[PDB]
Ligand binder design. Structure first.
Ligand SMILES: Cc1cc2nc3c(=O)[nH]c(=O)nc-3n(C[C@H](O)[C@H](O)[C@H](O)COP(=O)(O)O)c2cc1C
Ligand SMILES: Cc1cc2nc3c(=O)[nH]c(=O)nc-3n(C[C@H](O)[C@H](O)[C@H](O)COP(=O)(O)O)c2cc1C
Lengths: 216, 216
């Protein structure tokens, strides 16, 4: 039951470095990242999946500064996912997306494909041209991917923690992201908690629905 | 299996108005909204859940004008969730959150509670004082809730569609949201698809991992 998964998952504070994802789970987490929904199927994202000691150490340099409490989590987890957003929405990317929708068989006609593209360009143009907020818009889609991911990995039986406490400038510099048209937003270590994970045995806490929720 | 759910879920384009959530499912979707993670457990959100004909019609007013293709989804679904973000992060809210964490039993000591609050205020202040991006930050947390929600409701056996194609100004005006300190971001109708849902039988399309995903 998915509600059980939602009530029992927790942000892991310490990982067991000896406990790896199975090779199958390593495929499955990639499936989760790929198949997340996004506004217009824009998919304005890149993922770095660090599973080696060298890879994880490159990521963990971003947990300099006031972010040392997060450094261990990045080193000790099995797999570490960096969620990145595109920095700008370009026409090359929009063509890639609609051509993929076509290859996958989503259009009965050429007309239907043209209309999909006109629809997507119109909607994207609203963000880059009029509102000038396309970076924020694309970032939101990435956070949506994260949310999907966290419940997904919980449902697979894996521990994880979302991390905003890192220096994106360091991480971007380390993987040359700016030059490739991306910026890091969230880091998610995935694995199995250790005995040092104090949050594993703490009760979960949320505001009551009588504050956060209205029915009409 | 959650990977099946991820591969088979789809944005519903048409709902069957005669098919309601069971009383139990109506509680479960609320549990999903409530128990989503958020940066610092800040929970900077409000949900409107419209299940009556009057309520759903009020929401659907936001889809008149240029967004008519989305209007019928909001009218015909069983339950329609409006995801709202806070417009500003205030100290009253931060106190509410940490006091709830305390009531739920997450602190062994007064010291531990003080440290949690200092930690959260420090991190929040970084967004409101420096950066001046706390609206964007809070909105991202809400999108993360959406991502969690969409996989959740799919895993419960329910159909849904995320909607950004609505007029937030109209929706905010209709529920007096600005005055209460919120803004609408995403509308999610939940229910069961009708035979008019052309997207139910279309193959899913994603960009290949050799573009979106790097391993290290
Ligand atoms: C976007 C985001 C950023 C977070 N950043 C961190 C972080 O840097 N360090 C950390 O220990 N936890 C981090 N958390 C975990 C949250 O504090 C956590 O989800 C919240 O306290 C509720 O805990 P739960 O995940 O156990 O339900 C983050 C959560 C989210 C959603
Ligand atoms: C944030 C967001 C906004 C969306 N807005 C709309 C919308 O206004 N109308 C609509 O029909 N679908 C909307 N969609 C659905 C997307 O087109 C869809 O997720 C994408 O094509 C992938 O297909 P799938 O959701 O069936 O996996 C939205 C999706 C998301 C995540």
């Amino acid at each position: 039951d998915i509600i059980s998964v939602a009530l029992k998952r927790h942000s892991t504070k310490a990982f067991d470095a000896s406990k790896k994802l199975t090779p199958e789970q390593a495929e499955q987490i990639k499936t989760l990242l790929q198949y997340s929904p996004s506004s217009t199927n824009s998919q304005p994202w890149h993922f770095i999946v660090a599973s080696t000691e060298e890879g994880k150490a490159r990521v963990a340099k971003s947990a300099a500064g006031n972010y040392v409490f997060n450094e261990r989590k990045m080193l000790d987890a099995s797999h570490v996912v960096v969620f990145c957003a595109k920095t700008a929405m370009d026409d090359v990317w929009l063509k890639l997306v609609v051509d993929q929708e076509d290859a996958d068989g989503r259009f009965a006609t050429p007309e239907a494909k043209a209309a999909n593209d006109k629809g997507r360009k119109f909607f994207a143009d609203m963000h880059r041209k009029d509102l000038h907020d396309d970076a924020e818009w694309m970032a939101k889609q990435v956070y949506l991917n994260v949310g999907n991911f966290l419940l997904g990995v919980a449902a697979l039986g894996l521990d994880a923690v979302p991390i905003e406490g890192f220096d994106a400038a360091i991480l971007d510099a380390e993987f040359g992201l700016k030059e490739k048209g991306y910026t890091s937003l969230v880091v998610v270590p995935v694995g199995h908690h250790s005995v040092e994970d104090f949050n594993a045995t703490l009760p979960k806490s949320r505001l009551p629905q009588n504050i956060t929720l209205t029915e009409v």
